[PDB]
Amino acid sequence: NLHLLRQKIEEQAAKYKHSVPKKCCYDGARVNFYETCEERVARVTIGPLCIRAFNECCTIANKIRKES
Ligand SMILES: [Ca+2]
Ligand SMILES: [Ca+2]
């Protein structure tokens, strides 16, 4: 469900008040191949906030894809 996915990611991204961790979130939400969120976030080295945003948005996206 791409419509819901978009809205829920926007809702979470809005919590990050700078474009860099915003993009960390958006990038996180794109993870949908064979690597899990945990595996994929291990290579994110920008800093703790970027890692949290990537994690949260990857997790949100994954849940939504699962429920569709
Ligand atoms: Ca921008
Ligand atoms: Ca990226």
Author numbering: 679 to 746
How do the authors describe this structure?
The resulting model was then used to solve the NOX-D20:mC5a-desArg structure by molecular replacement (MR). Unexpectedly, the asymmetric units of both NOX-D20:mC5a and NOX-D20:mC5a-desArg crystals contained three molecules of mC5a and only two molecules of NOX-D20. The two structures are equivalent, with an r.m.s.d. on all atoms of 0.25 Å between the two complexes, in agreement with the fact that NOX-D20 binds both anaphylatoxins equally well. mC5a adopts the canonical four-helix bundle conformation which superimposes well with the structure of isolated mC5a (PDB 4P3A23) with an r.m.s.d. on C-alpha atoms of 0.43 Å. The NOX-D20:mC5a and NOX-D20:mC5a-desArg structures reveal for the first time the active conformation adopted by an L-nucleic acid aptamer, in particular of a mixed L-RNA/L-DNA aptamer, in complex with its physiological target.
By targeting its receptors C5aR1 and C5aR2 on a wide range of immune cells69 as well as endothelial cells10, C5a promotes inflammation, vascular permeability and coagulation. Here we report the crystal structures of NOX-D20 in complex with either murine C5a (mC5a) or its C-terminally desarginylated version mC5a-desArg, at 1.8 and 2.0 Å resolution, respectively.
